[model samples]
Target: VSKGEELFTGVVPILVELDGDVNGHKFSVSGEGEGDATYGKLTLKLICTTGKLPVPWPTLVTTLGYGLQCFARYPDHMKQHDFFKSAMPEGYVQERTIFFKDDGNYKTRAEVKFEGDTLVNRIELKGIDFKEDGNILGHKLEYNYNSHNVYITADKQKNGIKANFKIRHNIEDGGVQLADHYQQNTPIGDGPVLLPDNHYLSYQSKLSKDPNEKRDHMVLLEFVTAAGITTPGWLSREQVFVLISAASVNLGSMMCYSILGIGMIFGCFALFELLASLVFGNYLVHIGAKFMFVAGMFVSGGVTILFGVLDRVPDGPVFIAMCFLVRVMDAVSFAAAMTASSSILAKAFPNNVATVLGSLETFSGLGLILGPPVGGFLYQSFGYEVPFIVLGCVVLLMVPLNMYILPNYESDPGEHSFWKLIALPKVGLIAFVINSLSSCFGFLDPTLSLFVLEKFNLPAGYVGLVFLGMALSYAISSPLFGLLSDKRPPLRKWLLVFGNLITAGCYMLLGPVPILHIKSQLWLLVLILVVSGLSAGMSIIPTFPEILSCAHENGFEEGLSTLGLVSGLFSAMWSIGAFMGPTLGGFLYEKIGFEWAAAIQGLWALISGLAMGLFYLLEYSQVQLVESGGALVQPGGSLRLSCAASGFPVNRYSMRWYRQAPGKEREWVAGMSSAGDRSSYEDSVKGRFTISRDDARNTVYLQMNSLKPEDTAVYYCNVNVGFEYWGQGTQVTVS
Candidate 1:
């Protein structure tokens, strides 16, 4: 008899064999040698199997329920383990291998034993096939050892040939861990055994026979100890809610900033217009100034609105269109505003106009300095909308300030009789002409910049920046020149003349300035702009006073009318010049190039200077003429002579009859009348034509004309009267 002896309490390897026959099918295993035979194997070989393994319905349903619980606890980790845990069958043998093949061959094998207070089992499997065309083949094998009983059964008649057997296996090493043959039979009481890290594990049935070839089926498994493994940390619903609220608050604050920045810029322009009108007069200057200010506000507002709309409905076409529209409208507003301001100031305090105007310009320039920074800040903090909204509100508020505080000067009711106004005085006429010519200078800024941009092919954005810089320069220099004029009038005039010439020369040299072409030398362009600004400032100041004096001499009414008339004229001339400058400059730029256009502008400036010089010469001639008595009027003697004795025709009929006589006959008849002492003829004829010795040199000489049978007549007189009688006359008549 085989003696059964208890093994020592130490780790040992043992194997046992079991044999059985059921339903005429053999299920048996035989081992060659065994010591103590502590572990035994049981196998079931099925002749036929179909579909999937006969997983009990209750077991599968219970496994799904467990997976749902895992998902609720750890969503991220659950997803990783989803495939593995989801399809598991429940109420199955804890340590039994169940296998099926595509050809209906199946097997089940198990070894059971006890370890401490727990039941341990080992299971072996064979003849499992998982292969499908164009789809992934997956297999999951699990072994479990526990105190809870797991029952499994199958019907031979319904599911085909089946066999089952359980054999004693080592309690320490033959449990569920041993059932996982690929994992090796680890000790059952080895605390918490972590599975291999991979979650998926598979082995090809043929891999066991060939050790050299790599296994076709891959095993991906991950392990976690029940005591130490992390599930996942969960976030409460309230934390998610708080994060969303903070984001909303940040978004709202950005919007508010954008509105504020835009409002300030528009508000400033409106205030300037209203104030300008009050300071100057409500004439053309004021009106034009108002137009520009209002237009600027409107354009700016419109652009802002468009910007908003476009942001919501962003597209390439709309964006480009809006940008171009803003650029063009802004350009118009700038040109109109600057010219109008210049004209008004020129009229208000002609002598100090430049200084005052320059001061105003400098102040306006402050807006430029402030606008971009404010806009940028608002955009950064609150977003674009806040700035635009702020701009709109500010502009709206300014309307009231403009209406109430702005001064309205009385307008001149006199008709604008151009010819009569000029004809009234030589000095007045000369002044008007010179002022009109000066207005053309308004074109220089826009034309030159446009030409430079096109000729140099500079970026449009950079070109705009250059203009901004020029504006800055204008602000600084305008007042300084004006102040200089107030301090020294003579110096101011010469300075103005010098400034004009210098500007003209600069224009001529602009083409040769390499800095204009090369962006690397942008500072040089800035230098040129500064020079231009200085020259412009110097020329405008002193010229204002001269313009005002000329207006006064030309018979402009006092008060607002005078100011208005001067300002209006200046504006009109400016408008014309501005229109011509850009249009002509563009044409010239296209036809000849920037170089020629610049040359032409320089020539224009030079011509203006020359014209000013000519006007000075003409004024000097007038002075000389006055000094030489050419303009003096001498009075006739105080004696009141009767028309009856005068040798002049008192009536048209009599004059006509008398003029029919030949020149000699007329003289002889006059002599005969005097000799006969015909008082009526002498008084009405010769006496009327006679000049007293005292009044012979008078420039206010008047002559009586007699109409005869002629439609037109020519009369000549060579009067040499001293303390003696006068000389004779010569006459010709036309019919």
Candidate 2:
């Protein structure tokens, strides 16, 4: 074990053989290294007369306790953060909870060995038991330069296991595992012995994942350490993750409150103030985003550097409020960035908003996919503060580019209102789709890291790559769906609805099935991430495109397409959901657990998907069923009633006539078998009316003569396809 670029990491598959009933008993073994930190690997196998084999990676036990920032960094402060340290021991790499007291302790005896040889070490059955630390066998430990390993073993007593592991220590890493007499050390007495050690140790030097796929499958590893391998303030996997979850929430919160997002809504309106129109509408996004970029550089960057002093800064509640403020500032910057970005693109490519914005999100997806792994590497190789600092710098670097690279222009698109946009047939649905799916999409950020790291026992680098698989799929799929929206009327709604359904199903499966099969779970999880990404992306791209479409074709434009009031309002729903999502993920993961959390998120998407589906069906029917007024007839006047010929498969088609008296169902009065040379079906009590077409302006009208007082009714011109479609109705009355 010479040094490698990583934490104390390894993965080896070995067999767990069983035969006969073994009694339940506590087990622990300690080793005295005969020489200076002996370094090596062991071809190992574990045999049990009754008990299950132990995994180097964490089990469900490790994950369930994944919270709180109370990992006492200094050995002296151990008492303050006492309950938390049980998961990790300071100053040593060879520490772990060998075997917990069993509910299924019947099968107990187990043997552990290296390469056909049983390297026995003197030990006793032990554990840091529950029920008020009355462990009857509280695991306590201590060692000196000669003490090289923690030998994990068991006895004839029930719940007992026996094993010998190889001693791994690199040149610089070789040292006495000195520690405060802590609970892990079996005192056989007074109370849980406090573990005492200042420095922590790792046995990896240079390490990395594949750059292309960012895959964690293959890697270079070593079982050695460099000079002075002791880390004075190192935290374990659990401690690091707790803060990461906190960071996840913090990261999104500022963004949410900063009210950042497509700000696509803001730019559209900002560009064209009703009285003063400009050349292009991208001004708001371009300028605002750049300003926010630079501004966030200062705020978030300082927070990153402060991460160096975070444990101190957040030692109290007040500092946390400050932390909250930083989230806000960072979010504000994010808001400026997104708002400006979408606005500029929409302005630059007025006619191709669907294609351009989709393309924007496509590239954005690439960043989101690639970003996590890089952060993992930074955190793994450097310190806790590195990732955030690096990210902050990246944001700062983009500022100048935002100012110069982004184009500027004015537009005369006139004024637009969010209210008007929302009123459009499919616009409201688009907003809801983006908000709900986006929130659902966000839940994974915090929980996924914990799930991958703990469940797979994979390194930080590996966890990021897992996420990359899904985002990569998202990046690749967004443009295709977005461009498709440009080709059809309201096609995006279909993608939005079905995509969520697929995602919801994925979540449900993740909740129950894969968890049961831990052996193949990671692979299944990876595959599911790809599906999740694809589904999420499909739901997203069409959102902006649909808004643009409805805003343009559905009316409310001075020239070209845009919306302000609706866009801004639409902006908040997604932002709020995204922030709330991660926060909720952390809480649910903490309480109900990852699988249940997945199910709940799935439920959320399911509800949203159903709502969107139902909404669209009604909107489509509304297109066919009512509201096409033409003339307001007077008492002595015989006015022609008309309907616009728009929602039709073909202009050349048969038509039908119907009348609704007030709130009555439309009753058929006549029909046209063929148009252009059409004929009408006559009813016995029908008034003196004849139907004819005016194709020049693409409309249909009914000319009635000498209408009597009983002729008051709403008339509808329906397609002969059994009312599958109709027009805005006309009102006629005898005054």
Candidate 3:
């Protein structure tokens, strides 16, 4: 409209690679964008890395670094100042953590120098006040380090094969005294740690102490436990395909009624969603998604709970049938639940939808890392069935969660069609990104085994480090990159766009490329994986926000805001990616190899990023809306209600006014020449509601002047279809 302001939007080239130097603190890094696409520079102020340990330890020792790293950066426990407290620190409390710092004078007590980013600790009790608290007493250290290997000399001994861990962390608060720490003891000199055990903040119990015992023996056990849901499919898939079996009830008449029950139920939901949009458009989808998700969780968990019982039942048709039913319910409900998880985001956060969405994924990313291991713990502790009851019911209890907090949002009518919405510009890119990203995620699960066996040759004992590398990097980078995505330049998508390419390189570095023929090194793979995780966050986290923005700009502008619809679709696509990742990974590994698999996957993302880049090029002109006017005028005060549409081009230009009197059909009052003399009405009583047009302006004025109490009613201006292409009605109260 001539009366409203136009809004347009804009990009960034992020840090792709970096090389720098640091002298204690003296460090500087300078780099410019490499190509025609590069637009920014990255400079590093510091560089830090792990130094050699006083005791020469192999790459396996690095696993301990992760366990200790988690403790030191106990981000979770430290956040809650109430988890655990120490009398010494007064009111201060911290979760189990590992502490490290420049003791202000420790460097002086011992001449310290960097052994090439390797933190090496030397026991120079050397005339220093010292007591060999049993923690460090048993160790006999005679070690040397140059580049990689730490040659160990001496008896290389052990006492009772005991390992002691002191859980402590650095604190910025002085009042908060470092609390009493725990000493973790292993039956052996060294043991592996699992990720799920890190949740000391939430599950406060001896979930596992000798968790390592579960490493090799329990490893296969956990695989079955975790994939227990997938096991029945193995048998059922074969049976269903081999026999091409069909089953039917002879009571066709009765079956007809019940069969429609399922179909009709689904159909009725569609009706309700459509009908409800008469008053509220896509908002209904949000509510529906939330409720459906909760229901799905119950259904899914209920099936798992049933599976627990199925374990004890003897094998027979009943057992096989039960397995079939459980898997069916599990897939349906879990899929439904996952689909809804993201749909609720826009409703939950109206302001920065993408930002909050990214934030949620950050934790969910963490959860993805933890779910398997934690689930394995539950599966073992409660023996499969109990954990389902526990977790399902627990989440079920959280169902009422959104009922109160989830704003009963009724979105402004706009686009709601699934197809049309998907067809929008960046909207499609987001779906592609999420689907591919998630698929890449699942890819590792299946391929990791073959790769480890063929490449790294490490067992599950310390394999936790690989995953930890991915998880920790993701955890740290998700929010950081998410927050960056929410920044000023709106570089999030471009970040996602370029990130795909960067990640492709990281992927190649880890496995797919020929140059690295050195793929067997655990350290190199871990490092690449860590960087992969970072790029994954950069690529994945930004897509959520981009989806919301893209949907609103296109979907909403076209018709329905479809926040729920968009969120649901995005989420579903993500799950699709998750499923595809492992599937593709396994298939590619079997038929060809990981290096080929990895390279191809990287190529896929590279191509997708380029596609997104095309979208990014045309993105400077953004979605815009110009809206103003909310007033409660006294009886006789003049009122001018104006509405204009932008963002998407409006196909319908001529605007009409409609008055929705209470409990009555909305009566059209102006616009068409057929509605003769409608605009001639005076601006006060029923006769006062007139339509005014200044042909130069795109806005439509529904003027109600000299208003009276009877004029109190809801008034809307429709540009085309009254259902979706209408401005929010102005509720007039002639006070």
Candidate 4:
């Protein structure tokens, strides 16, 4: 019994014959038994009476012998035991119906029977076609106790051969509580076979904890084929998410997926995000922000539901095309909605951009926090399409609510250049900050689950829970950080700086880089992830407000058009980073492994923080340039002009002089290079313009000898450094 063999010694099989005619078929059963001092012997057999039998004779005999052995070995008291229950067949005969297409219309009926309470013992498929030449092939699978057989039939074949291909079925006793597991090994025997000898397929399936392997139960099969020829490697939950979506079209290498996936999905989304944000940003200026917001929501929600529709379509060129189309629409709608959101907030809460943005992040973070668990539950419970439908419907329901509640501000859709908006050094730096934050988030999304699983050996659910630390912390801290920035506007810059810096530290410790030599621990990783979330919130919430502030300080009018441009820039930068992060992260992860990959990403965050700090310092340095000594002079007169600099060093930096004639473009005069003490001149003022600097008084002098009529323009002194400083124009009128 433990070796999956019957305990009863049914060594001698006895032929059983009985006269039973049912549906033009006659069957017979015979039994013989011998009982000695302490042991008993019993055997049963079956025979077909009317020419060829409907079912194979050998299969019928094998199944009957095993049933009689079990019946003889276990008395009525032991009949209810699992061993007896597993050995005998249960339930009544039932036939399942299936339809086949026309042009070759066919009907397939499956008559199935279960062995014991749950395991399937027989599946007889009888398929018949309406067309004369298209008589469907019939095949039946049967498990006769220890032996398994498959009966195949064709046009002229009758009483099909029972192919005994399965070599063994070993049932292991897995204790009282655990389910009984069995291993089946099948090999193609010497019967016109072309493949190599001794090559067989082996698989293991454990019975459910119901102590029964029901036909309806979900079974996980573990295949242990010979050698490493066909090892379908296991994947972590995160790896499944990363690769499954990519591999759904076709299984390929990570390299293949890297190019194909990034190009198709991430790259496409990034491109659409950029273009849509800019296009809709400008359009939102003409159409009210609320209108764009509502339209975006409608489209976004509709497209999301369309994803569920796409699920039903068969896989082919059209399916692939539709997939890309929906992905593109998703990106476009996201860009539009996000762009309008910022503008709407800017108008509604003009005084508290940071605070409102932070509050907005709080809600977004909550959604991010709740999304996985809720989506997973919905997916698990309702199948493939329900999650999408539910989530999309939630967004659609909010559209009307937002239309009513979200403030709409209409203003002059002024001629604002997107380039000009980002051209400001401060605005550019803030955009970088936003991009960096988004990239970090994207990088983690595809890589973190696998890392946690590898390091901690966590299950899928626990690995998912790992992210909640970051998301929950982010949700809680965003509003707080937003409030802080709103109260103390100057702190917004530091919030970005410190936020990135702290996140960098968290990332470095997450891998606990080799240099740190810290042991990897689940608790430590959780702590790092939580702190990283807080830092992320701190960093991202301030970016929009910071962009607006920078724009305002740099002479941009406080209007909706400016808001549109800023919002668009912010979304565009974020999309650019979003595309870069996952593709680069996956590639790096494949080449260098996760630890070093994480460390490298940390370095990026560090650089972003440091660069932003330097940019801000130079921007707000407040350099003052003063030019003097402008007078009316003859064409050949020599004029001397002096310029004074304050708030920054004068000697350590080089200076340039530019002259702009009234209503004319500014022309370069002469400039001193950082490497040289003397000034170099342009062709127009080659030898006449000379500049000298005084180290003691922080002033520079420009002397023009033999002034020409062309030099009769405004001469300005400039400090060519970070945040270029220009002196007030000195009109050296050469009349």
Clashes of 2: 54
Better of 3 and 4 by TM-score: 4
Name the lDDT value of residue 277 in candidate 2: 18
The alpha-carbon lDDT assigned to residue 219 of candidate 3 equals: 9
Cα lDDT tens digits, model 2, 13-52, are 2222222211334222121111111122222212222223
Best by lDDT: 4
| Candidate 3: segments with Cα more than 4 A from true spot | 1-290, 365-385, 396-407, 410-415, 515-519, 555-561, 618-735
Q: Report residue 240 deviation for candidate 1 (angstroms).
A: 59
Off by over 4 Å in 4: 1-263, 369-394, 400-407, 622-735
CA RMSD of each candidate after superposition = 52.1, 34.6, 34.3, 39.0
The list of candidate 1 runs beyond 4 A from truth reads: 1-352, 381-385, 407-412, 415-465, 490-492, 513-524, 621-735
lDDT of 1 by residue, 1-735 (tens): 101012211122222233332223333332211111111111111111222333211111111111111111112332332211221111012222322222122243444333342222233333334343201122121121111111123232332112232211111111111111111112223222222222321110100112342322111111111111355565334333322322222222222223342233333333343334333333343344445434544554555545556557566787766655554554444444444444434433433555666666565566556667777887799986777777655654544444333232323244443444435443343343334334334444556556556556766567657767766776788888778777776575567656777777667555563544634344555677667766766665565565556656565643434545455344444444444555566667678876666667777778777665665556542110000111112233221111111222222111111222443322211211112222122334444443221122221122334423321222222111111112222233323
Q: lDDT score, residue 688, model 3?
A: 60
TM-score of each: 0.38, 0.43, 0.44, 0.49
For model 2, state the Cα shift of residue 59 in Å. Answer: 84
Candidates 2 and 3: which is better by TM-score?
3
**The 10-residue segment with the lowest total lDDT in model 1:** 623-632
RMSD versus native structure for model 1:
52.1
